[PDB]
Design a protein around this ligand. Structure first.
Ligand SMILES: Nc1ncnc2c1ncn2[C@@H]1O[C@H](COP(=O)(O)OP(=O)(O)NP(=O)(O)O)[C@@H](O)[C@H]1O
Ligand SMILES: [Mg+2]
Lengths: 304, 97, 200, 239, 96
């Protein structure tokens, strides 16, 4: 994933598992547990957050791009319009509905007005949006992985202050994301040398057949192969949970919690393990999947 | 810019510095303006134009005004033991104009 | 667990005794952390009651004309649907002042008034209020007051008959049990056996 | 391309105040500018005399003839021809960097990042004007544009030198902006007209320790000290 | 109707006036002398030539313009320095 982005290994791992989200559960009385993995990248400028969103936009089977200022809350859920073919009031699907059984990319997410973010909540919590206006009283499916990019309230992350003080969003919204990643452009000569020489190799690219300086019109898979692998794993394997994985999950969840952690953290660990089982193309979730899921969520929570 | 009531589209309406183009504009009690209102003056007061870009309108109007303004110092009265920038709250970019 | 809360929640449904007025309604607020997931408990007892209704702070009556046709109607809010029943106010700390004053009038007079569009009325609201509220900054600090932790005003909290601050405390004991319960639900697509038989 | 013009907070730059207090813009929006120029009235009298003679030559109408002579002499080109030429460069050429240009740019990035790190330590706060990997791409774009003038299909060492110089002249210059005991110690122990070789002062102060270079910067801005002889000799030149 | 040209310009006088105004304006709170004030001297001289309906700016127009701009600058200063500054600037203006 994103071979032109240096570093960010744990984020690209989380992105891969988010492209391959865990199985959705349906229970008694039609009770529902969501299977999407919702990611928030918050951090310093020039940390490839937007570029990672643009890679996801180019890699998922069904992705809808949005930006904080450019998005209305109505433009996000669904909008009433008159169908001039007949003259009746009809709903027009917004970004969250168009991304159903897909993903939504949100750049500049903390720049949203809060009457927009009030409309995010039902998609995250219930994978649905409800309309109660214009004599139209309906509920629409919005079952999709939100991946979002944001900055702190200050221009860069301030390690002197708490995450709720650094991060603009309410805790009632942050708790709905599966993985909250904090990234920084923290200066270091070795890492700066590495990222720099990588970026220069990236900028020295020339696509085939073009002349030198002409304007445009260690094993790794190709992006078409990767897209096919994701489609295969989404369609053809539904990993079943297994006790040997449960033991790792409960051990890690209790350890993480008994040192920000909350009840929602547990099914996030289950989702990450289930998605990693999909990466193995395996009919069962196993102890390896729980170990990787706990390692990755531990990175996200502790900055490990 | 206004949503035109008979044309149902956006159109411009010239402010005082359009109405007084090739003329004078007279802002009495200049120190009482809200600073967001005051700082609208700048382009018309030096570049002698107004460059609106709103609601899909994008154009530059002529605003060839000599502006004469009247102000009281801070607190209501001058103080000759203070230099100018401490007598009045106006910043250097507007004072220089 | 939380059988003290469950024991109190029942006495909403049966209520006290009214007399010539003296009132039968009983009101309770479930404060504290959102990680306890109190919303599902409100949902449950809302379904138990024969007349109740589930709502969010995100309630007042209004002359809500132009519903489908351009047309006149008076909307009795959820507090009037809950007349002779339970109004389950989820997200109780998030409500706005019009709804706060609506809750004030029903919790005192058991009515909600209108003085709008020429219509001047008092709608009947003999309702019991079940509420759930969550703290500022996400998680409740136990050493600080509820007034420090939660957006609600003290005078309104004083009018509730029971106040339960159900916190979420990490525990090497409880967390294994909750984890095994939840993972059973994920692994078998149904809840585990309860060690007792419930009433439907 | 976004070309933007702004005044600082307090209108005039207010040099003795912190840049984080003078600059309204958040570090997010600032990082999206390849080059940030901080422009100041120098108040130098020779410069002001020169500007006055020039501006008078504008208002007198002398400049109308001067520009025409400059254009016909081939030292200047007109609006029209330059407009067409920018279009032609934007459509013909789009140069790459040579490997040598790439290495020089990479090492320059780590160099300016180190400078920003030590400045943030010396001022004990995150800088308002940032240096980020996006700003390496700023120097890359500037390098390419400089090669794009002459329609050279590759950028070279010379173009990288000019790109680095411009970035140093603009964004770095924007970023660039107990000792009281040590300075009076140096005033006591080095009288007027004599030289202390720097390394001995470093040993003596360390033997009492970064206050040294702040003291030297302050005393060098003042007339009291002069860094003679390749910076080796601390010379008590003034008072 | 009237558009006065600058001519025969006392370039050195306006240059010295602006240079001194800039130097003495380094006082942190003073009226902030800037290049638009230099152009203001020329606008004011042109306006005085306009008052005479004269298509050329005489030395009298320019000298009156310098007197206005210098007095406007001097008048804005605090009493602690205004006498010294007015004495210093007098060479440009009390020659008229
Ligand atoms: N690790 C990296 N490897 C390669 N390029 C990078 C890396 N990090 C940042 N960049 C470059 O930085 C530029 C800006 O990336 P972008 O994704 O817009 O940053 P961002 O995190 O979204 N910053 P912002 O939108 O201001 O919060 C792009 O041209 C990237 O190629
Ligand atoms: Mg971004």
């Amino acid at each position: 994933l994103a071979p032109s982005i240096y570093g960010h290994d744990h984020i690209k791992k989380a992105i891969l598992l988010m492209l391959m989200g865990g199985v959705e559960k349906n229970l008694e009385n039609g009770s529902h547990l969501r299977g999407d993995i919702n990611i928030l990248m918050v951090g310093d400028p020039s940390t490839a957050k937007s570029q990672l969103l643009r890679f996801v936009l180019n890699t998922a089977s069904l992705a809808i791009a949005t930006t904080g200022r450019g998005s209305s809350g109505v433009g996000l859920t669904a909008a009433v319009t008159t169908d001039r073919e007949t003259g009746e009031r009809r709903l027009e699907a917004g970004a969250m509905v168009l991304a159903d059984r897909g993903v939504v990319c949100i750049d500049e997410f903390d720049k949203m007005t809060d009457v927009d973010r009030v409309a995010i909540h039902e998609v995250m919590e219930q994978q649905t949006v409800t309309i109660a206006k214009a004599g139209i009283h309906t509920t629409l499916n919005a079952r999709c992985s939100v991946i979002a990019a944001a900055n702190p309230v200050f221009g860069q992350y301030d390690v002197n202050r708490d995450p709720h003080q650094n991060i603009a969003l309410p805790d009632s919204l942050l708790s709905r994301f599966d993985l909250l990643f904090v990234v920084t452009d923290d200066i270091n000569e070795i890492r700066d040398r590495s990222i720099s020489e990588h970026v220069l190799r990236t900028h020295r690219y020339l696509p085939p057949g073009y002349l030198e300086g002409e304007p445009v019109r260690p094993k790794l898979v190709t992006i078409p192969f990767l897209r096919k692998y994701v489609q295969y794993a989404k369609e053809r394997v539904i990993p079943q949970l297994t006790q040997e994985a449960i033991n790792v999950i409960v051990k890690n969840y209790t350890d993480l919690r008994n040192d920000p952690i909350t009840a929602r953290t547990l099914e996030t660990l289950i989702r990450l393990a289930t998605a990693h089982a999909k990466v193995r193309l395996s009919k069962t979730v196993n102890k390896v999947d729980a170990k990787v899921a706990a390692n990755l969520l531990r990175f996200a929570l502790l900055g490990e | 810019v206004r949503k035109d009531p008979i044309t149902k589209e956006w159109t411009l309406e010239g402010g005082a510095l359009v109405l007084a183009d090739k003329g004078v504009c007279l802002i009495d009690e200049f120190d009482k303006m809200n600073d967001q209102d005051r700082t609208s003056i700048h382009e018309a007061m030096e570049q002698q134009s107004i460059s609106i870009s709103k609601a899909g309108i994008v154009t530059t109007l002529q605003a060839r005004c000599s502006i004469i303004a009247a102000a009281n110092p801070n607190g209501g009265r001058y103080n000759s033991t203070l230099p100018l920038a401490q007598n009045v709250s106006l910043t250097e970019p507007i004072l220089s104009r | 667990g939380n059988l003290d809360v469950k024991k109190a929640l029942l006495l909403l449904l049966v209520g006290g005794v009214d007399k010539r007025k003296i009132r039968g309604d009983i009101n309770v607020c479930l404060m504290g952390d959102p990680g306890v997931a109190k919303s599902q408990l409100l949902k449950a007892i809302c379904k138990i009651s024969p007349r109740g209704v589930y709502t969010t702070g995100k309630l007042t009556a209004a002359v809500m004309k132009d519903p489908v046709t351009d047309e006149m109607i008076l909307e009795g809010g959820a507090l009037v649907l809950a007349d002779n029943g339970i109004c389950c106010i989820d997200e109780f700390d998030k409500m706005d002042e019009s709804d706060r004053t609506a809750i004030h009038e029903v919790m005192e007079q058991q009515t909600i008034s209108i003085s709008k569009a020429g219509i001047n009325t008092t709608l009947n609201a003999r309702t019991s209020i079940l509420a759930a509220a969550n703290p500022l900054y996400g998680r409740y600090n136990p050493r600080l007051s509820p007034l420090d932790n939660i957006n609600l005003p003290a005078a309104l909290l004083s009018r509730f008959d029971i106040l339960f601050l159900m916190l979420d405390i990490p525990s090497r004991d409880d967390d294994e049990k909750l984890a095994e319960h939840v993972t059973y639900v994920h692994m078998h697509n149904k809840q585990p056996d309860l060690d007792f038989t419930p009433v439907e | 391309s976004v070309l933007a013009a702004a005044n600082p907070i307090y209108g005039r730059y207010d040099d003795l105040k912190s840049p984080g207090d003078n600059i309204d813009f958040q570090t997010t929006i600032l990082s999206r500018f390849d080059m940030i120029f901080i422009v100041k009235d120098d108040h130098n009298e020779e410069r002001d005399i020169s500007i006055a003679n020039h501006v008078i030559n504008i208002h007198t109408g002398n400049a109308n003839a001067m520009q025409n002579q400059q254009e016909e002499n081939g030292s200047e080109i007109s609006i029209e021809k330059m407009k067409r030429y920018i279009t032609y460069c934007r459509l013909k050429c789009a140069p790459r960097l040579s490997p040598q240009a790439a290495e020089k740019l990479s090492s320059n990035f780590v160099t300016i990042r180190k400078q920003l790190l030590i400045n943030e330590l010396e001022s004990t706060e995150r800088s308002s004007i940032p240096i980020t990997i996006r700003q390496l791409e700023a120097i890359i774009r500037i390098t390419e544009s400089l090669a794009k003038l002459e329609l050279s299909p590759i950028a070279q060492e010379r173009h990288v030198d000019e790109a680095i110089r411009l970035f140093q002249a603009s964004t770095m210059d924007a970023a660039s902006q107990e000792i009281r005991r040590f300075e009076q110690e140096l005033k006591r122990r080095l009288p007027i007209g004599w030289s202390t070789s720097y390394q001995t002062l470093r040993r003596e102060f360390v033997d009492t320790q970064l206050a040294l270079d702040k003291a030297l910067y302050a005393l060098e801005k003042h007339e009291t000290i002069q860094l003679r002889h390749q910076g080796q000799n601390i010379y008590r030149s003034g008072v | 109707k009237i558009y006065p040209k600058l001519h025969q310009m006392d370039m050195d006088k306006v240059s010295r006036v602006y240079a001194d105004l800039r130097r003495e304006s380094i006082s942190t709170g003073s009226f902030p002398i800037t290049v638009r004030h230099l152009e203001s001297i020329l606008r004011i001289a042109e306006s005085f030539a306009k008052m005479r309906l004269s298509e050329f700016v005489s030395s009298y127009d320019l000298d009156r313009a310098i007197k206005v701009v210098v007095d406007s600058f001097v008048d804005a200063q605090k009493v602690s320095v205004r006498r010294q500054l007015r004495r210093s600037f007098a060479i440009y203006t009390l020659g008229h």
